[PDB]
Enzyme design. Structure first.
Site, PDB file in Angstrom:
ATOM      1  N   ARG A  31      34.170  39.925  37.009  1.00 12.89           N
ATOM      2  CA  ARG A  31      34.404  40.262  35.586  1.00 12.89           C
ATOM      3  C   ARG A  31      33.623  38.948  34.561  1.00 12.89           C
ATOM      4  O   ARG A  31      34.033  37.936  34.867  1.00 12.89           O
ATOM      5  CB  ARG A  31      35.955  40.319  35.144  1.00 12.89           C
ATOM      6  CG  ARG A  31      36.316  40.430  33.783  1.00 12.89           C
ATOM      7  CD  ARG A  31      35.554  41.577  33.056  1.00 12.89           C
ATOM      8  NE  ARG A  31      36.543  41.924  31.862  1.00 12.89           N
ATOM      9  CZ  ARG A  31      36.477  41.455  30.714  1.00 12.89           C
ATOM     10  NH1 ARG A  31      35.295  40.534  30.557  1.00 12.89           N
ATOM     11  NH2 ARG A  31      36.853  41.780  29.470  1.00 12.89           N
TER      12      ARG A  31
ATOM     13  N   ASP B 134      30.800  44.923  31.411  1.00 17.99           N
ATOM     14  CA  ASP B 134      31.382  43.440  31.503  1.00 17.99           C
ATOM     15  C   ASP B 134      31.626  43.354  32.861  1.00 17.99           C
ATOM     16  O   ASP B 134      32.590  42.365  33.088  1.00 17.99           O
ATOM     17  CB  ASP B 134      32.382  42.849  30.473  1.00 17.99           C
ATOM     18  CG  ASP B 134      33.777  43.722  30.461  1.00 17.99           C
ATOM     19  OD1 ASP B 134      33.811  44.332  31.547  1.00 17.99           O
ATOM     20  OD2 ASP B 134      34.252  43.684  29.392  1.00 17.99           O
TER      21      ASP B 134
ATOM     22  N   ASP C 225      34.203  40.603  26.077  1.00 14.14           N
ATOM     23  CA  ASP C 225      34.817  41.849  26.201  1.00 14.14           C
ATOM     24  C   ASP C 225      33.941  42.962  25.498  1.00 14.14           C
ATOM     25  O   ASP C 225      33.610  43.129  24.348  1.00 14.14           O
ATOM     26  CB  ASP C 225      36.115  41.870  25.275  1.00 14.14           C
ATOM     27  CG  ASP C 225      37.093  43.168  25.793  1.00 14.14           C
ATOM     28  OD1 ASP C 225      36.868  43.728  26.720  1.00 14.14           O
ATOM     29  OD2 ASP C 225      37.689  43.671  24.614  1.00 14.14           O
ATOM     30  N   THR C 226      33.373  43.859  26.485  1.00 10.88           N
ATOM     31  CA  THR C 226      32.578  45.055  26.009  1.00 10.88           C
ATOM     32  C   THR C 226      33.692  46.038  25.681  1.00 10.88           C
ATOM     33  O   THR C 226      34.562  46.325  26.338  1.00 10.88           O
ATOM     34  CB  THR C 226      31.675  45.469  27.066  1.00 10.88           C
ATOM     35  OG1 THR C 226      32.145  45.455  28.492  1.00 10.88           O
ATOM     36  CG2 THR C 226      30.442  44.212  27.205  1.00 10.88           C
TER      37      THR C 226
ATOM     38  N   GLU D 243      34.857  49.821  26.449  1.00 11.30           N
ATOM     39  CA  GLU D 243      35.072  50.633  27.591  1.00 11.30           C
ATOM     40  C   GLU D 243      33.873  51.790  27.404  1.00 11.30           C
ATOM     41  O   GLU D 243      33.759  51.857  26.419  1.00 11.30           O
ATOM     42  CB  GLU D 243      36.391  51.232  27.833  1.00 11.30           C
ATOM     43  CG  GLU D 243      37.693  50.120  28.057  1.00 11.30           C
ATOM     44  CD  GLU D 243      37.427  49.086  29.252  1.00 11.30           C
ATOM     45  OE1 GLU D 243      36.932  49.902  30.173  1.00 11.30           O
ATOM     46  OE2 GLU D 243      37.728  48.238  29.024  1.00 11.30           O
TER      47      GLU D 243
ATOM     48  N   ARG E 260      39.284  40.362  40.631  1.00  5.14           N
ATOM     49  CA  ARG E 260      38.061  40.313  40.171  1.00  5.14           C
ATOM     50  C   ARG E 260      37.517  38.753  39.956  1.00  5.14           C
ATOM     51  O   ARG E 260      38.169  37.963  39.645  1.00  5.14           O
ATOM     52  CB  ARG E 260      37.818  41.120  38.958  1.00  5.14           C
ATOM     53  CG  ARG E 260      38.181  42.475  38.956  1.00  5.14           C
ATOM     54  CD  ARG E 260      38.070  42.980  37.463  1.00  5.14           C
ATOM     55  NE  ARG E 260      38.794  42.549  36.443  1.00  5.14           N
ATOM     56  CZ  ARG E 260      38.967  43.020  35.289  1.00  5.14           C
ATOM     57  NH1 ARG E 260      38.321  44.084  34.825  1.00  5.14           N
ATOM     58  NH2 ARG E 260      39.585  42.152  34.418  1.00  5.14           N
TER      59      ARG E 260
HETATM   60  C1  LIG Z   1      38.277  38.348  31.118  1.00  7.23           C
HETATM   61  C2  LIG Z   1      39.581  38.072  32.008  1.00  7.23           C
HETATM   62  C3  LIG Z   1      40.484  39.080  31.983  1.00  7.23           C
HETATM   63  N1  LIG Z   1      41.424  38.827  32.487  1.00  7.23           N
HETATM   64  C4  LIG Z   1      42.721  39.861  32.483  1.00  7.23           C
HETATM   65  C5  LIG Z   1      43.121  40.142  31.117  1.00  7.23           C
HETATM   66  C6  LIG Z   1      43.594  41.376  30.826  1.00  7.23           C
HETATM   67  O1  LIG Z   1      44.924  41.790  31.640  1.00  7.23           O
HETATM   68  P1  LIG Z   1      45.308  43.283  31.113  1.00  7.23           P
HETATM   69  O2  LIG Z   1      44.624  44.195  32.294  1.00  7.23           O
HETATM   70  O3  LIG Z   1      47.019  43.204  31.506  1.00  7.23           O
HETATM   71  O4  LIG Z   1      45.380  43.810  29.577  1.00  7.23           O
HETATM   72  C7  LIG Z   1      42.291  42.085  31.572  1.00  7.23           C
HETATM   73  C8  LIG Z   1      41.257  42.538  30.702  1.00  7.23           C
HETATM   74  O5  LIG Z   1      39.989  43.033  31.588  1.00  7.23           O
HETATM   75  P2  LIG Z   1      39.146  44.081  30.953  1.00  7.23           P
HETATM   76  O6  LIG Z   1      38.768  44.025  29.695  1.00  7.23           O
HETATM   77  O7  LIG Z   1      38.297  44.399  31.987  1.00  7.23           O
HETATM   78  O8  LIG Z   1      40.165  45.404  30.689  1.00  7.23           O
HETATM   79  O9  LIG Z   1      41.966  41.188  32.525  1.00  7.23           O
HETATM   80  C9  LIG Z   1      41.753  37.467  32.990  1.00  7.23           C
HETATM   81  O10 LIG Z   1      43.256  37.401  33.331  1.00  7.23           O
HETATM   82  N2  LIG Z   1      41.107  36.432  32.865  1.00  7.23           N
HETATM   83  C10 LIG Z   1      39.835  36.777  32.309  1.00  7.23           C
HETATM   84  O11 LIG Z   1      39.190  35.564  32.108  1.00  7.23           O
HETATM   85 CA   LIG Z   2      36.327  45.599  28.701  1.00  5.90          CA
END
Ligand SMILES: Cc1cn([C@H]2C[C@H](OP(=O)(O)O)[C@@H](COP(=O)(O)O)O2)c(=O)[nH]c1=O
Ligand SMILES: [Ca+2]
Length: 129
Positions: free
Chosen positions: A29, A15, A34-35, A37, A75
């Site tokens: 991103r 993702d 959510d994929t 890891e 991102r």
């Molecule tokens: C997809 C997405 C993720 N995020 C943030 C929330 C999560 O914070 P935390 O890192 O504190 O958990 C993280 C999850 O991304 P990943 O799934 O890439 O880890 O990215 C956003 O803020 N907005 C978005 O639209």
């Molecule tokens: Ca992920």
């Protein structure tokens, strides 16, 4: 919403993809998904699926939604298209991503993606198996 040009720099995982957008390298991103890891079950399959889709595309486009365009990690937050096919939807339809991270104002394609998830689940595909 509007599609804008980008070019592939490098696939990263299911993702996230490194793209050049307005001439600058950025990690993108995928919105609303959510994929797993890479270290988790289906993570390597999700990474492989997104890699094949973006590497094989003649044209990549990003589409920002109405809200936040970058997250707290810097991102880019966008829907990604490979030769017109939305990567976010394709991952969900194949059971390689769950709909997730649905924040108000950045959720234009939520119901499109939920419909894909329902279908992947009915098919018991991948994560849903
Ligand atoms: C997809 C997405 C993720 N995020 C943030 C929330 C999560 O914070 P935390 O890192 O504190 O958990 C993280 C999850 O991304 P990943 O799934 O890439 O880890 O990215 C956003 O803020 N907005 C978005 O639209
Ligand atoms: Ca992920």
């Amino acid at each position: 919403l509007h599609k804008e040009p980008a070019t592939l720099i490098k696939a990263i995982d299911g993702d996230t993809v490194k793209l050049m957008y307005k001439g600058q390298p950025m990690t993108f991103r995928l919105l609303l998904v959510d994929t797993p890891e890479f270290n988790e079950k289906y993570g390597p399959e999700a990474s492989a699926f997104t890699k094949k889709m973006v590497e094989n595309a003649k044209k990549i486009e990003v589409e920002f939604d109405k809200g936040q365009r970058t997250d707290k990690y810097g991102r880019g937050l966008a829907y990604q298209y490979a030769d017109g096919k939305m990567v976010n939807e394709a991952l969900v339809r194949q059971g390689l991503a769950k709909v997730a991270y649905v924040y108000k104002g950045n959720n234009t394609h939520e119901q499109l993606l939920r419909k894909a998830e329902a279908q992947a689940k009915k098919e018991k595909l991948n994560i849903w198996s």
